[PDB]
């Protein structure tokens, strides 16, 4: 069975759950970001709270695509995880059989192509609040294998009417369809405590995005109007339609044309077009960008930048507060999700027996922080000459150097 105890039947693993839903694969995103107003955004969020996640997912995708600063921040945050070395470790004080199981799982993950793509797809749940990856199960004789990992759009799911924390497929029915066991890797990182609909970071970031969009569009319009002044022509009674058209064309082309002549009975008045500055717009854009930076990566390095300054402890100063905390949180949540969803089916299908769930191997990301070799290498000799018996295992582990074999 799975970790949650639901019965597992190997018959349903031959075909993906969504195969019998050919309607989903033919859908196109509705792009709800175009022509978006604060009222529309509020309605979208409220409806999403009630189980209509399609519009929210499409809006989040548009928001990711249309904002360069937000996209850069999210990409940097995800690439931070994608570059971490990982390993599979056996449970606490594991036995020989458990160690062998962990070693086999580690070897299987090493030789499993598409792991990086799986991690990238799973990390989308950081912003979207939940990411679902469908599994393709195949048999190369007697051992089950994940053939491929398919990322399904968040717009394909909904909320259970009887449960606000349980996701279901959109199968044209009011209650949707329950997710098949062992058929998905659902990643639901928890930045804030609440239901799945409210758990996305883009829900926090939506309003600054709209503020920045409005400011940028208004600035573009004002830059378009800038330049020549608006000038209005006046004509006396008894001016025919042809003369009216001639005066109109003359006024229209007068800005580009340096000189022109009109009868003394006519008049042209040059009125202010748009007089001001870009200061308000740029102030709003900077405020929104700082808010986005703080919300995504913390207000110590991105928005209120940590500035330059090297040194042996500079790495620690830059990392440990804020950056290390965020990195560790994301890595630990991703590792927990993976150990729950991918490691367990492999252990319970590819190996004999029914090992207890509490003793399953856990995927661990390498969060080791580079320690100053020079300072500590200076420090050891004094301590050892004093008489302290420092274990070599601690040194080898903390320095990153492996133990002799």
């Amino acid at each position: 069975v799975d970790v949650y105890g639901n019965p597992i039947r190997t018959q349903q693993l031959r075909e993906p759950q969504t195969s019998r839903l050919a309607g989903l694969a033919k859908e196109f995103a509705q792009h709800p970001a175009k022509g978006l107003t604060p009222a529309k955004l509020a309605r979208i969020l409220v409806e999403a709270e009630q189980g209509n996640l399609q519009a929210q997912a499409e809006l989040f995708m548009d928001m990711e695509e249309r904002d360069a600063h937000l996209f850069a921040e999210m990409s940097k945050r995800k690439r931070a995880i994608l570059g971490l070395d990982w390993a599979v470790e056996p449970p606490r004080n594991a036995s020989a059989a458990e160690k062998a199981d962990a070693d086999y799982l580690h070897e299987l993950l090493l030789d499993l192509e598409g792991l990086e793509d799986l991690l990238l797809d799973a990390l989308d749940g950081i912003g979207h609040g939940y990411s679902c990856i469908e599994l393709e199960w195949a048999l190369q004789g007697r051992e089950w294998m994940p053939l491929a990992f398919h990322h399904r759009p968040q717009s394909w799911f909904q909320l259970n009417p009887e449960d606000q924390n349980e996701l279901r497929l959109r199968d044209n029915s009011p209650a949707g369809e329950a997710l098949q066991p062992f058929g998905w890797i659902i990643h639901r990182p928890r930045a804030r405590s609440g239901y799945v609909a409210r758990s996305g970071l883009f829900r926090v970031l939506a309003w600054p995005y709209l503020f920045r969009h409005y400011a940028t569009s208004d600035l573009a319009e004002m830059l378009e109007i800038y330049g020549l002044p608006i000038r209005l022509g006046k004509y006396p009674p008894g001016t025919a339609d042809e003369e009216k058209a001639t005066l109109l064309r003359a006024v229209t082309g007068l800005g580009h044309a340096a000189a022109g002549i009109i009868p003394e009975t006519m008049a042209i008045d040059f009125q202010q077009a748009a007089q001001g500055s870009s200061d308000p717009f740029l102030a709003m854009m900077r405020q929104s960008e700082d808010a986005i930076s703080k919300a995504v990566l913390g207000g110590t390095l991105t928005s209120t930048t940590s500035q330059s300054g090297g040194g042996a402890f500079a790495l620690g100063q830059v990392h440990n507060e804020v950056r290390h905390d965020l990195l560790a949180s994301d890595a630990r949540q991703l590792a927990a999700t993976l150990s729950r969803d991918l490691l367990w089916p492999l252990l319970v299908l590819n190996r004999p027996g029914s090992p207890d769930v509490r003793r399953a191997p856990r995927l661990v990301f390498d969060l080791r922080e580079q320690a100053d070799i020079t300072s500590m290498a200076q420090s050891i000799p004094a301590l050892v000459n004093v008489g302290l018996e420092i274990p070599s295992a601690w040194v080898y582990d903390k320095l990153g150097i492996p133990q002799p074999a």
Binding site: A22, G23, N52, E162, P174
Partner: protein, 93 residues
């Protein structure tokens, strides 16, 4: 009081099948009845008219499509939230 959830869950079926019943009476995009014998096609007129209906299921569209515009929100009248319970009897809806 919670049985209203079951009632709401059953509601969409009732609505869709009521529209199915009205199919003969109600009008489609053509301007004629959904099940009519005088459906206007470009050159000529076609015709598709106890309680039967033959529909496709594998097409990109499903006949008699529903619209779950809002969820089965639960509306309640518990205590100091309405006037039915202080300046009135001890009633709850």
């Amino acid at each position: 009081m919670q049985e209203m959830g079951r009632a709401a869950g059953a509601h969409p079926d009732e609505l869709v099948f009521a529209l199915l019943k009205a199919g003969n009476a109600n009008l489609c995009y053509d301007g004629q009845n959904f099940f009519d014998t005088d459906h206007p096609v470009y050159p000529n007129v076609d015709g598709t008219g106890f309680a039967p209906a033959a529909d496709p299921g594998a097409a990109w569209y499903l006949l008699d499509t529903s619209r779950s515009l809002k969820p089965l929100i639960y509306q309640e009248r518990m205590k100091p939230s309405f006037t039915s319970m202080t300046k009135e009897d001890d009633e709850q809806v």
